[PDB]
Design a protein around this ligand. Sequence first.
Ligand SMILES: CN(C)[C@@H]1C(O)=C(C(N)=O)C(=O)[C@@]2(O)C(O)=C3C(=O)c4c(O)ccc(Cl)c4[C@@](C)(O)[C@H]3C[C@@H]12
Length: 257
Amino acid sequence: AKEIDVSFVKIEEVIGAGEFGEVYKGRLKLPGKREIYVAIKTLKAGYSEKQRRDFLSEASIMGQFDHPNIIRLEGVVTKSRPVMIITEFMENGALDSFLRQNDGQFTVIQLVGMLRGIAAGMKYLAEMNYVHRDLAARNILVNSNLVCKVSDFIPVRWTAPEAIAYRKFTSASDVWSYGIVMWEVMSFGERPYWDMSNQDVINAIEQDYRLPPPMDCPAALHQLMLDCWQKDRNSRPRFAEIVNTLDKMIRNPASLK
Ligand SMILES: CN(C)[C@@H]1C(O)=C(C(N)=O)C(=O)[C@@]2(O)C(O)=C3C(=O)c4c(O)ccc(Cl)c4[C@@](C)(O)[C@H]3C[C@@H]12
């Protein structure tokens, strides 16, 4: 939780209306340091002291994380009004819209690199005993160099069956969600289960339906999705094994067909 003087921040265009409030693209220029682009999150106008505390508690959590695939907190504005959370700027935005706007424009190995980065950030979060519960391509952000970073600090079709049926949220239910993300990425942002209703998805999953390989998806990558979607949460790979499998695919690209 580093305190940033608001005079070091210039707020430019709006780039989103999140749930707590608005997000802006801005510039951060600390004395003696090179200027960087940042995302500035604001709380909706008229926020209560309780909403303020809730907001700054989110910041406190983000500040604990220091990983290349986790959104970096630059600092907070709390001495002046309104409060703000300042994070690193991700030029390409949310991963799902980024893929939908660039359909077919990335190679398989670029896509696997993106998935590897996400798995590495998720490994770090799980190692620190945090369960995301909301892992989806819409909650991953992408910088100018295609590095993907986990953000967003019940979406039924992203959620593990035990998490829906028994509210048991663990890193193993995040792994289920990660398998759905893999499918979104390899499909360039298709909707999981398409137009199936939430209950249709639940019923299908209970009858051992699983999503098919996206077009031109390597068989080995779709198999790793299916491993993530094992009914028994203990049979799923942990994020450490996912990273190692994706590394081995990257290091052995013949594995990709
Ligand atoms: C902390 N808060 C400001 C937002 C958030 O939830 C993040 C986080 N620390 O988990 C972000 O990554 C964000 O901090 C963050 O980095 C965002 C951001 O840079 C961005 C860019 O660059 C392009 C498109 C979009 Cl949609 C976004 C955008 C709206 O998702 C924001 C979100 C914020």
